Amino acid sequence: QISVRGLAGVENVTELKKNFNRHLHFTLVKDRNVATPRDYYFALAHTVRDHLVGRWIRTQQHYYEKDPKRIYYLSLEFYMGRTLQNTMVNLALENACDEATYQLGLDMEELEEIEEDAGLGNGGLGRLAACFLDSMATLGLAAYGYGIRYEFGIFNQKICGGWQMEEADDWLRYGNPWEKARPEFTLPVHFYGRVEHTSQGAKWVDTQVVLAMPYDTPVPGYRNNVVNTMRLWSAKAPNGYIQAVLDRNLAENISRVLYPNDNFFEGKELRLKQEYFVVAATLQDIIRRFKSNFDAFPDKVAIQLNDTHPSLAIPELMRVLVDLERLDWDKAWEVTVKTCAYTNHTVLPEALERWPVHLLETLLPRHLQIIYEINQRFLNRVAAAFPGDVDRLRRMSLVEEGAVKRINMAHLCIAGSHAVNGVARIHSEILKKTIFKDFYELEPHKFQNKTNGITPRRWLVLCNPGLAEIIAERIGEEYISDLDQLRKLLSYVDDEAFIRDVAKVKQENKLKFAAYLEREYKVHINPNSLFDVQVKRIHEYKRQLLNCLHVITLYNRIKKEPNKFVVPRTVMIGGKAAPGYHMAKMIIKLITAIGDVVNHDPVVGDRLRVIFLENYRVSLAEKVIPAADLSEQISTAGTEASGTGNMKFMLNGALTIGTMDGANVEMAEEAGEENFFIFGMRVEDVDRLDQRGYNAQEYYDRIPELRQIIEQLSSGFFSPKQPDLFKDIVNMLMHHDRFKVFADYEEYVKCQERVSALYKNPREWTRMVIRNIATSGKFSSDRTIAQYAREIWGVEPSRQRLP
Amino acid sequence: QISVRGLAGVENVTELKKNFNRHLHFTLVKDRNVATPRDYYFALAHTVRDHLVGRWIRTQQHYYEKDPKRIYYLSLEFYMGRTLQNTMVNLALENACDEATYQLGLDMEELEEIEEDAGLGNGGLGRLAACFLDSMATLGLAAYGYGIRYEFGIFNQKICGGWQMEEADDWLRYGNPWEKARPEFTLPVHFYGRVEHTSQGAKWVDTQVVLAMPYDTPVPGYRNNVVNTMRLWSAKAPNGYIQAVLDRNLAENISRVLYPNDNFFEGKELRLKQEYFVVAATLQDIIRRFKSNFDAFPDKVAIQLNDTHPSLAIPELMRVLVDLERLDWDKAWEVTVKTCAYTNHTVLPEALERWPVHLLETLLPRHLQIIYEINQRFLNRVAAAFPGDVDRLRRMSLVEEGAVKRINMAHLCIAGSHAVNGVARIHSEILKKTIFKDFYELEPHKFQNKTNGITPRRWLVLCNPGLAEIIAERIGEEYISDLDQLRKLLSYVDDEAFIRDVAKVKQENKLKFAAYLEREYKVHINPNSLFDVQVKRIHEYKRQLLNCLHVITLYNRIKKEPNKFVVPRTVMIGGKAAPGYHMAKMIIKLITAIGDVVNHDPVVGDRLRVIFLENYRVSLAEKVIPAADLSEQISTAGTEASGTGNMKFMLNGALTIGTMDGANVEMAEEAGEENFFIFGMRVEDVDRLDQRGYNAQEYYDRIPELRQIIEQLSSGFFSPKQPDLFKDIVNMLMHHDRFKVFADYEEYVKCQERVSALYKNPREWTRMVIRNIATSGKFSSDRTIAQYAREIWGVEPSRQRLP
Ligand SMILES: O=C(N[C@@H]1Cc2ccccc2[C@H]1O)c1cc2cc(Cl)sc2[nH]1
Ligand SMILES: O=C(N[C@@H]1Cc2ccccc2[C@H]1O)c1cc2cc(Cl)sc2[nH]1
Ligand SMILES: *Cc1c(COP(=O)(O)O)cnc(C)c1O
Ligand SMILES: *Cc1c(COP(=O)(O)O)cnc(C)c1O
């Protein structure tokens, strides 16, 4: 009955039932007597997949004939989630498939739950790539995503005894209908070896070969008949005896598993192999397609680098042009810089990729030679521009001196790219001011901003059809790919029916999430409570620990004054910790340990509950975000480059409690600061504390309620059977806290009081929500991609449909 | 135009073209502009596959409703070859598909060459399993093949510098249309651990688990609408961090690769794991299906053991019945023996499986306990039957004493089976007389013969349609599944048209094979020469070396008397050597080295050529066997249990030169010895030499032409650049030859003179061929399987069609 889900035409429904039954028979080899639920999911998936094929063939033929400039988005991560619902939405088939399956006696939503996530990313950076593929198709760009087909994605998180456990994410176990292997496009990638010199120049010889086999996945645009491609590479061995065959596993391990580090450089050789594996195969593919003079190469090709992870594209392109195509160095370098552009995602120093020179020398000897030549010529430019500024040369160099000499891969990216961008206004400004100040002064024209975004298909129409419908009832459907049209909703801030309908939808979403938790985990939550949600990867800089301190404050205040009314809350925290990150793992145990006390105190009862949401991932975000009342975005000012979870909550009818960090600043600017719960130190205040020295003891000595909590943690109140369980957390907070948790405690608690005060007035809570939804339009990834296309790639977007 | 290939009906051809184009689009995602040859092969394969589905569903439903006794054929090898042509032949679609592809502008035979062999066997034993699956379907038996889905089959053989090179057989690289994964039937298999005791009895605990995922392949009967199943199991891991995920490879290595030992026991733990892996999963499957008292288990189940490789089925069945179903030991043993039967394939002692007790104790502790209990109770029966015969107890025991104590797996099989059979009359008699004499005296009723056979679908209709057609022109098509009808052909021994037609067909086949060698290897052979062919695995007992001595004899005789006419020959030898088998590898180099001299001597020219056929496998046998004039079957009497290559040559119009060994004896009995080129020691003569001692020097001292050749090998005539290359071959022949090559040299050379003499008379050569083809009917695997069904399994075969 919801119009945004399309038409269920009589001949279309008849045909879908016909083809469903055909696939059940010929493709799954089943009758309705023995057919499993998974069989039914697979039949529907193939039925829907068939509707993509004509469009996919015709799109790629259209690009050959039109011959536009081609866009190549290189990333080690594509955090895609599930594909069935997204495909139906973009092809306008959702209502027809729902009716067809209903008539066959099946519930399509049950079938949808059987699909594995394609969890080929860690967090923000990986999900941005996925939103970008969707927006580039919707805007008619001749764009290709290039990455690795990991056999195992981000690990499955189980919680056992309050602790995170990791299990392999065997996502391909039952087959993936949404990929097509492409045998005729397999290519060789080279490792190790050595450099020699012929009559013609340098030659890379005596290498070990690993084959790269590509798998193509379709990427449908929104109701425009465009289907683009995501190409992911899989490692294959080339071809006593038995051990030799078993040892094929070693080369094949290159594509085995996603490294689960979110913001942290670990420096493993296998990770370096993965990076070169993607780069080498992708660039071969690009050059072949270009051929089917290199002066026009940058007119026909753009390569976008998602962080420094594919930075080897710069020396690899130079290697191919100089050593194989035999261009002169200076010509080849002109071409490389005009082709490549680099996006930076964080300022935290331990995230920076700095590879030991000995490791590169051994694995990629020709690339190290090329990097040294790039460095000499780049520093000669610096020396000419700033004569005698010797320390500037030291700071800007691609080579970092020390006990272990290393290559700074960010420096390599800036030198080899015609554009460098940060991911929100505040971040992009800091790059110019501080972090890459010297580079900005040499080449100011290179530095740009492209504020992040999210797709309103997955993150509104798919996950929250009820909200999409009430919006469409007032302003039509154009907003779905023109999100700034949501500003029309400000005209309904005093409209009784809209106020009613916005609150109705939120409550339906809350009931549905409550039912998921009861069904899947036998966990009961109070449906008449404020849903307070912090979901994102577990990190000190994101300050899940600050949330912890507030939850314990609410508990202690209840115990002090049991008779005083408080707004009931369900506090929900979720996200994965990196397997080797001890503090993050201790923080997860703290959250569950708080719950073990709070959730069983009879004085508290259902006035307060705290729960850890297991296995946070793209499909779970689609469930919980539409149910949220309060969005927790509480990183220390200066630490979160942008964020994108923040945007998802704003679009789905939650109010935000946050710091003036990342894209939070632009969100508040868009809605008006009066409509956001802003608190805590600004960047300028953090910097002032750093100048004098952060002393956590001062805050402990001055704040009675804080002392109480620290003593509870120390003495074993939250770990009775192991009193010293949380000693390391207490020690870090008191003496080694780089993120200043205690310094924002008082403002955070006071800001939360104001949240509860507004929640007591349902009408005014909803009116503030309307003012948020109505001003979320800037955060569409369509806007972001249009900016990349016009300001970096030199192409003009188009929402025109193909026949 | 050949009627045996079926009807090309107008609506059928139209529909096949329609569905071909549909699969090219929806399944391969291609148009006719970019479609690769492999794409076209895959489109035809899916089109043909769709015709199997209804029949497969209906057959297995029919077996549930009818509830017949079920037959389970357990083997570590299924040597299947290619599937496309076989499927078309059995469904009567060959002429229709040929016309459909022709009308689309494609050559179906080109498409057929793209399919990889399923080379999941080594030689005779593995190909017998494959012929048996075909015959059981054609005879309407409710039969299942159970084995392992090896990721890599028998190695790809390359010849480089005259030497065998091994490469991995990556047969699944592009996808296998002819398997269907079955997720809902995945089962756990257990390894290692220890035994403990509860209130109820023994319990196997603390094990390591490996999952077994089944893949089902359809097995079509000949034009009877029956489709049976071959179920092959694949190993899957159950589910710091990164290494833990990589280490999943270790469990998964269980199904990685076929062990390339043909007749030789190597005793590797990984091989033992493979054997238990198949047995455990298969028996779980059997027991579940039985449930969907165990007194009726043998009425509903037969388990056939293809050699001792799945012998662990005996203690595994006892483990399940006693430890899990809680039957008393004696009842469980009644059931086990009535369920199981064992087929023996060779008498060579080094082939016998004798596992160290320590290895079994560690990997399979409960199974070793059960084996010891089986042994005690079995020897108590022997002691009662033959009181005081202490050495008999030692000889019959399942436990073999020594520096390393071992379990004799053949002894385990005889004790735990209600029937034991050899594979040809002479072999089955020797089992009773000598090899298992003591067991025969205890239980004479257990011992049987089942002479081997080959399917006349693959090995006549498929590979030699021209011969199938000229036979059908005279006697109709009933012979195709009633091969004894070939005896009608004796009535045409003086028929001028049939004599003409038999020779015409052979010559067409010879032209086609010559064209294959020119196309694929740029090797030219003389089309007006006798094609002399020895194809089979390389082994001392098969005496490829005796063939070598004869080829050198022909060369030396030509050089002695250049003016004397000799019948031109192309001598062809092919087959694989086990990677660790040094002598077999040296024998391949000898063959190529002879060719390097013979094939370039201008005095010889095209009067004699010797060539090594690379990568002998099922698809290559289908090419060369129909082209052969002379079949070499020259094993030392007493060493080849049966043979089956011998049968393939007889059916396809070649005459045989052989010893009275294996099934050669029964072939000669069927045709009349006057129609076979029989030579050499009989078994009785070999035994007499063994009693006095084989002295090769006597033969060297008495035979001038033999001395010449040995001196040529010794002095470096066939290896000028490395004079001592063949010293080890000479040393073995002169001092350590277990197979008495020199003792059959003179009779072999004289027998070959008689072959050439008959070849000079084309009419009488062809008349002898007719007398061979006409009497090959006994060697149909349909006859073999009917005997297994009636004399061992207790089921009645039926060639009646399903609707
Ligand atoms: O995987 C696909 N086709 C396979 C080709 C092939 C080759 C051998 C055996 C089985 C199969 C098909 O499953 C496939 C078709 C489409 C259409 C899309 Cl859109 S995405 C996609 N994958
Ligand atoms: O492999 C088969 N079907 C696959 C089921 C499945 C599940 C996910 C993605 C792709 C696919 C199909 O290729 C298949 C169908 C038939 C019919 C036969 Cl007869 S043998 C056979 N295999
Ligand atoms: C959007 C998203 C992220 C990023 O959220 P942030 O709060 O901006 O860090 C991480 N994980 C998943 C599953 C997401 O959908
Ligand atoms: C039939 C067959 C065998 C067995 O042949 P023998 O001469 O009896 O040893 C071995 N390999 C292949 C490929 C076969 O087809």
Description:
- Two copies of one chain form a homodimer.
- Chain A has two domains: 1-453 and 781-803, 3-Layer(aba) Sandwich (Rossmann fold); 454-780, Glycogen Phosphorylase B (Rossmann fold, 3-Layer(aba) Sandwich), CATH 3.40.50.2000.
- Helix content of chain A is 48%, strand content 15%.
- Chain A contains 33 helices and 25 strands.
- In chain A, strands 1, 4, 7, 8, 11, 12, 13, 14, 18 and 19 form a ten-stranded mixed β-sheet that branches. Chain A has a six-stranded parallel β-sheet with strand order 22-21-20-23-24-25, sandwiched between helices. Chain A has a three-stranded antiparallel β-sheet with strand order 15-17-16.
- Chain A is globular.
- At the A-B interface, helix 2, strand 7 and helix 7 of A face helix 2, strand 7 and helix 7 of B.
- Bound molecules: the ligand O=C(N[C@@H]1Cc2ccccc2[C@H]1O)c1cc2cc(Cl)sc2[nH]1 (2 copies) and ligand PLR (2 copies).
- One ligand 2TH sits between chains A (49, 52-53, 56, 178, 180, 218) and B (27-29, 42, 175, 177).
